[PDB]
């Protein structure tokens, strides 16, 4: 993709004790016009891993299609063997690299979250194929804005509980609602555990404007 | 230019201006901007003209062939998928503002939108065209959940009226389309 | 470079980080970014260093002239008007990202100046390259009418987050507090980063270098 | 760059009670050298030198201009100049050409005129001063001299180890450098006397 | 384009330019003169954009003659060199820059002989031997091979003979005749014009 | 970058420096530029490391193929021809390569000069590189055909010393190879500063 | 528009000993004016006697690592024996020239043992040359690190200083000092240090922290 | 960004968002986008910020000096003429979306519009700002001639509400200004 | 003005027997958005001549100001002498030429119509200073569209009556409403005779759309 | 840049190229040979991009030798000229064009001697005398004053001597030695190497 038409915005994900929470909003802005204000930007992959992305929404639909077909195929193998989330991460990295090697990149910014076999997993995939693991990921302007809250609390406390993690995600999305121009007060939280994968509904934020009464 | 599709309980309602322009000169004063594909499914276009015409012809080809081979009436989401595949695989050279609507026996009336990129979404109402921003300004003001047919006709009539009145590219004459289970009822308003 | 400003219940607490990079190499570990203007008004700069320096010295000279001509304490709004008029007169050629703060008779007043000449009065601002992390800490943990130690801890936290994010400073975050009566200025506030001790004595010796031509010149 | 048109490297290093300044000797156009005796360290009064690096035109012009203003100051006022005063003068002279800028990075190293206090600072091509405590460098090669001096510097230095430390730093950083070489001159000054030594550097 | 050589001795300066005034295909003039007698013991050479060469000769030559008629005496070579450098550095930062390549050859009663070296960016130099051009490359390897600071003038003439004979061997331009000067305790003495039949 | 080559009565002299910079930054001081193609061939490195290394390695491969198929050692001109033919197929695509080919022949001495511009030429004296002109000057001072052995050694050594003394992009160890009738022989690898002390006086 | 390269930065060091090859690298991965992580080791353990470090563009580093591992397994499953060090160096040079006209933007250092059991550092360039040198510093902090190693490993520019063979723990304190001293001035260096030591008995690793900015 | 001015019988009513942005980052969350000049005359700005600030200060200078020399309250059309001259004279460097409104004793409430070019026109209502196209879509739909004060307040509230909801640059909080013969009544609303 | 912000559109003018009729519409479009749909693009100069223009409306306000001041000055001379329309045409031509000589052109297209001393006058002024007289003028796209109708009827009949001229103007404006994208169904007709200068109200057009019932 | 004259006689062809193989500063080789004996009575010259010269020489020379071994006899000069022109016209409109400047010199049993003239745009010409480079410019005028269709070969050699003596007088490049061929009823006879000592 040379020119991204319909972009999303920042995606937040962080591990906790035996699970990964991912939250991204539901906005499909074109240029500055928030044209598609009710879209889904997280795919709930089969039972362990879970995907969220940024960049071109059409490319996300495309990779949604391809990953869905591959997951359906392994589940129809009937062998009792699944994809680890790290295997999905490797495949996606190779896919993005082979996209940009042919000078036709997929304009995305993807976050892979998974919990399989006791261990959580949270992987990152860039457009250029830059890919790594991290205890807390933040895309787009989130790496500029909501990343230091994650890096503050994880330095202050390396492990978490589910409630503290979810609350921290809520606070970061509030902050992104405050000062991202491409943002919207409607977001959805998605969560993986060993109990399965769960997508919560379109939550919102609670804002403050008491600094506006000053001059 | 400015195209619009609104669904209701029974079916969907379409609408467009005409005014095919080239630069600042009007080449054509009256245009079938909306195009039949199947007997129950329409699409209305924007952007470049030749691109959307050739794509719509190929979609008519593939969709007619598939729906004859099924020996069943086609889905609407299927035609949306066809426009999605042809738009996304060969973007880069096209400028398509394709909006798919149409009644279905299984799923009722549906409205899909395919903008210049190639994403596909189902909507309850849609805008499209360069002069669509303004009535996109108030279509989230005037909309009420659960309209009738006449409320949709009056609604889109006021919409395309103000869009044709304000935008320089929009104008011409008003074409409407009402698609339901019963039949296809098209009409042309003027003045 | 991450400067910040805030208004507590009485005055203004300013902070800074003092890594003056020239391109990609750390060129300085201690660069005074908190500049003098008046006995009550201070200023911080960002972006092009020498432009901010020459401009802030010129405006401080002009306000010293005006204040000694008047015979009373200067006003912050006069500094704001001079700065915005000068920066608009240079048409945005001079890049000077400024934070202006002082306490007048009316009380504390904080201004941020964008280098074309657009200015704003705010209860809290962040400027610089890593300003986003400090603005994150501000938008998370600001409340109106903070106290003194609360505001100092907050500004320290913000500049600390800017330092744990990229292009902060090695420096020991500088602070400055302006009240109605008491002006303070604290360079070595908190040193989080001790330098690691050397592991070998890689000291040269008295003759390990060939000398071609010596000279001695006595003095007084 | 335009700074890499004629090469050049100036290092200044602060010792315990004394200060050492050194520079390279090579002069030439982009790949063709010309001479090995081009002067880049100028005396500005007693026990205080200045070094200039970059394009040689602005080197000689700013050195003569600064000598002009310096003698006018020292004749209107009988005392000799303090180093902060010289720093402010060089900053003003460079900032007068804000949009017509000279291409130079002046380095000032001198002692106190009243006490024996050393002083180092450096400026940019528009007039940004920077006072430090260990060393300042300028010219084309930067990262080499930063790595060497951050490797070898100690706070309290007798002048001999000061001389040898700045000697090894200049020699190694010049031998890694391409466009700046062909000998090193070193000025090691103090309250009592002024020493100028030339080292046997590689002529390659 | 071409090069004019400037060999310094113990008590003499051996300068030698060419006589070529070509224009981009044809050699219009084969006895051109680039030698500008400033004073009784001060020479000057110039190569560059050939509309600037003449204006430098007017300005420098006549302003030095103005100093000579004003005060009572001849300049040092050093002050003359600095004055040329100053006028380059002043004429550079304008709408009208000059693009010339000079070198200066003088003789003092006290300093003895002196050789200088300009550039189109106004750089002074106190050189043992200078260079410009492509002959810069060739003449400086050969000359830097065979140099002695205490060299007699006939050894320098023989070295220059050899250097020109190795200039006519792998050079693309023509350069048929070189004129040669010398400066001594007396003044400017013109030696014979140095050409070679090549083959 | 400064290389040279010249053949004479007693075979061929090839010398080179060992400095390979990167812009304004020197990478190494001991870059062995004269690529030993065969026990009877010597190739050089003239502009670009990877291109010279790759194409001369491929040429060594091809020459070994030719000998193992014909039981008869390849000539010099044939090798230069193969190198020029392989280089010509990427003309304009941005290859910088100005290498030299030296060796002993059935005809005797052989000295060719192959460019990435494809300027395959014979000759008697050559010099390639940024400071090659300096070598041309001092070499065409000291050149003859009827030279001695140690004279040619001193000629090449003085040549590389003057070249690296004037040019900035040259330096490091001075290699020195000598092509004989039977095979080539490395003479010495001499540092610049040692030569500066020896030849400064 | 779309630019195909991006500068991730990084610093890789190598020291060739008498019977050891020490390769060390920080684990900071950044981009522009951000930090992506503080754990991304540039070192990779190929065989029992070979450690490779890869800096520059990160995706090409990962891709190149995986291709090298594949060809290692191909050589093993074809020829019943592991590769040497110089064969791997030659193979990497063939690869880097095999994408000449769309280059990898990757600096590479392979350390390891030769067949004599001695240390060997093979440096590289983005286009595919290599040479057996004793020490290299690749990446952003190359110029901050080469002259100090020229002073200490090479014993250059010194007078009457004899040549002692570089022992192990001397090399360790050297590596620690150069990464601390370079982390003082670099912006692309810090947050950890992964030190790989190749002996005649295997590969050792060691984790040393740094300053957190 | 999105600025609005509506007159009514007694006086005029203004309105703006706040949200001063730079690119995609918000520099300032709350802003006095409308500016007092005289005690009865406001102006609300758009385009670049520094341009409008300097122009508004110079207009404040000239108008205050002139109105002191008249010893009479100034006109609104006078200030509009001042903005016209200063905008037109440096149209090459300024980006001003200045809209002048204000009550006058001789002429009541008036609304003048000066866009980026430098033309001057009297209007009954005005839009302004980059996210103003949408409520410009329906400001010719909802408007009724002869509103009251409360109808104008509700009108501009709905206007700036939908503009702030839809446009990315617009948003923040709603600031209002009511200018009549009696006084100037400002308030900060949200909803 | 280098870049025209707010442009007008085409202006039509034609002589008749003892008078000149000029009609232009009332639209102030910015780009394609018809932002100012009620503006005046004709200045009624004192009693004889009369001006209509196109292009940037701000420059038209400027020339309105300057010409108004000049006419006021001569009328305050009190000499009984006025400007002939041809003198105004000359002045405007010299003004535009001296404007464009400084590489800062006035983006306009102006038409001067006047009736003085028995004889009508209809002058043209371009941005570049190109200036001439004509029995019928047409600016912008009017020179492409309504010019051949004028030149048709003037070839078939060189003189006209006032009613025929006004009807022909009405038809040409109807056609321009049909196929100019920058056009609007609201225009005002201005007419000069010896009886004075008269500005008629905002007239409209009567359109046809019976081709739309075809396919 | 460089130069080759193509004088046609009544029953002979006088071609003369140079021996210069310079590269952009230095004259690397002063005994270069641009003369390509196609057959027993057909010569070929070439000037252009010096990587293309050799590859064109390979192609044409070996395909003509191939024709000679095929059919049993020598080509006409005319068919060889057309074949070269044809190969230029095919090689131009591709991804790999050639930028060379040729001329062909042959001798028929029936047509006698023949001179052709190419260009880098594949144009045939049947010329009385041709040239290339910048000495082309000067020399065809010099040659065009003093031409006779019935000219003897020693007059042509003397004429070429005069033309070279006027080439070394106002030209910017060096061109020290010219090699000279001749074509007769016998074949290709090499004349002596023609250089001049200038001064």
Short mmCIF file of N, CA and C in Angstrom, two decimals, chain I residues 23-66:
data_model
loop_
_atom_site.label_atom_id
_atom_site.label_comp_id
_atom_site.label_asym_id
_atom_site.label_seq_id
_atom_site.Cartn_x
_atom_site.Cartn_y
_atom_site.Cartn_z
N UNK I 23 -25.37 41.82 -17.32
CA UNK I 23 -25.92 40.96 -16.29
C UNK I 23 -24.87 39.98 -15.80
N UNK I 24 -24.75 39.86 -14.48
CA UNK I 24 -23.89 38.88 -13.85
C UNK I 24 -24.60 38.31 -12.63
N UNK I 25 -24.19 37.12 -12.22
CA UNK I 25 -24.87 36.47 -11.11
C UNK I 25 -24.26 36.88 -9.78
N UNK I 26 -24.64 36.17 -8.72
CA UNK I 26 -24.43 36.62 -7.35
C UNK I 26 -23.84 35.52 -6.50
N UNK I 27 -22.79 34.86 -6.99
CA UNK I 27 -22.25 33.71 -6.30
C UNK I 27 -20.78 33.91 -5.97
N UNK I 28 -20.40 33.49 -4.77
CA UNK I 28 -19.06 33.71 -4.26
C UNK I 28 -18.30 32.44 -3.93
N UNK I 29 -18.30 31.47 -4.84
CA UNK I 29 -17.80 30.13 -4.54
C UNK I 29 -16.32 30.10 -4.20
N UNK I 30 -15.98 29.28 -3.22
CA UNK I 30 -14.60 29.05 -2.80
C UNK I 30 -14.27 27.61 -3.15
N UNK I 31 -13.48 27.43 -4.19
CA UNK I 31 -13.17 26.10 -4.66
C UNK I 31 -14.38 25.58 -5.38
N UNK I 32 -15.07 24.61 -4.81
CA UNK I 32 -16.35 24.18 -5.34
C UNK I 32 -17.48 24.53 -4.40
N UNK I 33 -17.17 24.95 -3.19
CA UNK I 33 -18.20 25.23 -2.21
C UNK I 33 -18.72 26.63 -2.48
N UNK I 34 -20.02 26.74 -2.73
CA UNK I 34 -20.66 28.01 -3.04
C UNK I 34 -20.92 28.77 -1.74
N UNK I 35 -19.87 29.42 -1.26
CA UNK I 35 -19.88 29.93 0.10
C UNK I 35 -20.66 31.22 0.24
N UNK I 36 -20.62 32.10 -0.76
CA UNK I 36 -21.25 33.41 -0.66
C UNK I 36 -22.27 33.56 -1.77
N UNK I 37 -23.48 33.08 -1.53
CA UNK I 37 -24.49 33.02 -2.57
C UNK I 37 -25.37 34.25 -2.64
N UNK I 38 -24.99 35.34 -1.99
CA UNK I 38 -25.72 36.60 -2.19
C UNK I 38 -24.72 37.75 -2.07
N UNK I 39 -24.11 38.12 -3.19
CA UNK I 39 -23.15 39.22 -3.26
C UNK I 39 -23.39 40.01 -4.54
N UNK I 40 -22.87 41.22 -4.58
CA UNK I 40 -23.06 42.11 -5.72
C UNK I 40 -21.74 42.24 -6.46
N UNK I 41 -21.79 42.02 -7.77
CA UNK I 41 -20.61 41.97 -8.62
C UNK I 41 -20.69 43.03 -9.70
N UNK I 42 -21.51 44.05 -9.49
CA UNK I 42 -21.62 45.18 -10.40
C UNK I 42 -21.63 46.46 -9.58
N UNK I 43 -20.70 47.36 -9.86
CA UNK I 43 -20.73 48.69 -9.28
C UNK I 43 -21.45 49.62 -10.24
N UNK I 44 -22.41 50.37 -9.72
CA UNK I 44 -23.09 51.38 -10.52
C UNK I 44 -22.32 52.68 -10.40
N UNK I 45 -21.46 52.94 -11.38
CA UNK I 45 -20.67 54.17 -11.42
C UNK I 45 -21.66 55.28 -11.75
N UNK I 46 -21.23 56.53 -11.57
CA UNK I 46 -22.05 57.71 -11.31
C UNK I 46 -23.38 57.88 -12.04
N UNK I 47 -23.33 58.15 -13.34
CA UNK I 47 -24.53 58.24 -14.14
C UNK I 47 -24.39 57.68 -15.54
N UNK I 48 -23.18 57.44 -16.03
CA UNK I 48 -23.02 57.00 -17.41
C UNK I 48 -22.40 55.62 -17.50
N UNK I 49 -21.24 55.42 -16.90
CA UNK I 49 -20.59 54.14 -17.08
C UNK I 49 -20.98 53.20 -15.95
N UNK I 50 -20.54 51.96 -16.09
CA UNK I 50 -21.03 50.88 -15.26
C UNK I 50 -20.09 49.70 -15.42
N UNK I 51 -19.81 49.03 -14.31
CA UNK I 51 -18.72 48.08 -14.22
C UNK I 51 -19.21 46.71 -13.79
N UNK I 52 -18.66 45.68 -14.42
CA UNK I 52 -18.88 44.33 -13.96
C UNK I 52 -17.61 43.52 -14.14
N UNK I 53 -17.39 42.59 -13.21
CA UNK I 53 -16.10 41.94 -13.12
C UNK I 53 -16.24 40.49 -12.71
N UNK I 54 -15.13 39.77 -12.81
CA UNK I 54 -15.05 38.36 -12.45
C UNK I 54 -13.81 38.16 -11.60
N UNK I 55 -13.47 36.90 -11.34
CA UNK I 55 -12.26 36.63 -10.60
C UNK I 55 -12.41 36.91 -9.12
N UNK I 56 -11.29 37.30 -8.50
CA UNK I 56 -11.26 37.51 -7.06
C UNK I 56 -12.12 38.70 -6.66
N UNK I 57 -13.04 38.43 -5.74
CA UNK I 57 -14.01 39.42 -5.31
C UNK I 57 -13.39 40.52 -4.45
N UNK I 58 -12.32 40.19 -3.72
CA UNK I 58 -11.67 41.18 -2.86
C UNK I 58 -11.03 42.28 -3.68
N UNK I 59 -10.41 41.91 -4.80
CA UNK I 59 -9.82 42.88 -5.69
C UNK I 59 -10.88 43.75 -6.31
N UNK I 60 -12.05 43.17 -6.55
CA UNK I 60 -13.17 43.93 -7.05
C UNK I 60 -13.65 44.94 -6.03
N UNK I 61 -13.63 44.57 -4.75
CA UNK I 61 -13.91 45.54 -3.69
C UNK I 61 -12.88 46.66 -3.67
N UNK I 62 -11.62 46.30 -3.91
CA UNK I 62 -10.55 47.29 -3.93
C UNK I 62 -10.72 48.29 -5.06
N UNK I 63 -10.99 47.78 -6.26
CA UNK I 63 -11.18 48.67 -7.39
C UNK I 63 -12.47 49.46 -7.28
N UNK I 64 -13.48 48.88 -6.62
CA UNK I 64 -14.69 49.61 -6.27
C UNK I 64 -14.37 50.82 -5.42
N UNK I 65 -13.52 50.62 -4.41
CA UNK I 65 -13.10 51.69 -3.52
C UNK I 65 -12.36 52.78 -4.27
N UNK I 66 -11.38 52.39 -5.09
CA UNK I 66 -10.53 53.37 -5.75
C UNK I 66 -11.32 54.17 -6.79
#
